[PDB]
Amino acid sequence: ASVYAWNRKRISNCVADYSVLYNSASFSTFKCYGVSPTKLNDLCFTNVYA
Amino acid sequence: SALGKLQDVVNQNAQALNTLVKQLSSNFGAISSVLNDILSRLDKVEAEV
């Protein structure tokens, strides 16, 4: 998407891994707020909005 | 209504304990009032702040 027109996905009922994301060198930056990236794999969420 | 002095000495201490407990639910500028949220959401470098 263009930044004026950003595309949102709701992640529905499922099991995840975030370490395949936060350990990947594919990303030039990987910030987090209110959570540590390395700690995501211990948690669960009511939804995720991407 | 007669024992107002004694009942007030009971009431002031009950209000003091209930206020001391309610302050466990306050954030004081932290991410959560619940210490187990902070320890389950963050790494030591953020959590100790």
XYZ file of N, CA and C in Angstrom, chain A residues 29-44:
48
model
N 15.123 -2.885 10.539
C 14.777 -2.460 11.907
C 13.620 -3.306 12.454
N 13.627 -3.582 13.760
C 12.625 -4.394 14.461
C 12.428 -3.830 15.878
N 11.719 -2.703 15.997
C 11.403 -2.081 17.295
C 10.168 -2.725 17.914
N 10.049 -2.685 19.239
C 8.812 -3.009 19.948
C 8.580 -2.083 21.140
N 7.311 -1.918 21.498
C 6.807 -1.003 22.519
C 5.796 -1.757 23.384
N 5.861 -1.604 24.705
C 5.005 -2.332 25.654
C 5.281 -3.833 25.790
N 6.104 -4.414 24.916
C 6.604 -5.794 24.962
C 8.037 -5.844 24.418
N 8.854 -6.781 24.903
C 10.106 -7.192 24.262
C 9.879 -8.143 23.077
N 10.533 -7.950 21.917
C 10.415 -8.897 20.813
C 10.779 -10.317 21.253
N 11.867 -10.469 22.009
C 12.363 -11.782 22.437
C 11.394 -12.522 23.361
N 10.470 -11.793 23.995
C 9.499 -12.301 24.969
C 8.149 -12.683 24.346
N 7.881 -12.289 23.097
C 6.605 -12.539 22.409
C 6.171 -14.014 22.425
N 7.107 -14.953 22.284
C 6.789 -16.379 22.221
C 6.195 -16.972 23.516
N 6.284 -16.294 24.663
C 5.633 -16.735 25.911
C 4.173 -16.257 26.055
N 3.721 -15.312 25.225
C 2.440 -14.611 25.382
C 1.299 -15.203 24.540
N 0.086 -14.707 24.785
C -1.055 -14.803 23.879
C -1.749 -13.436 23.766
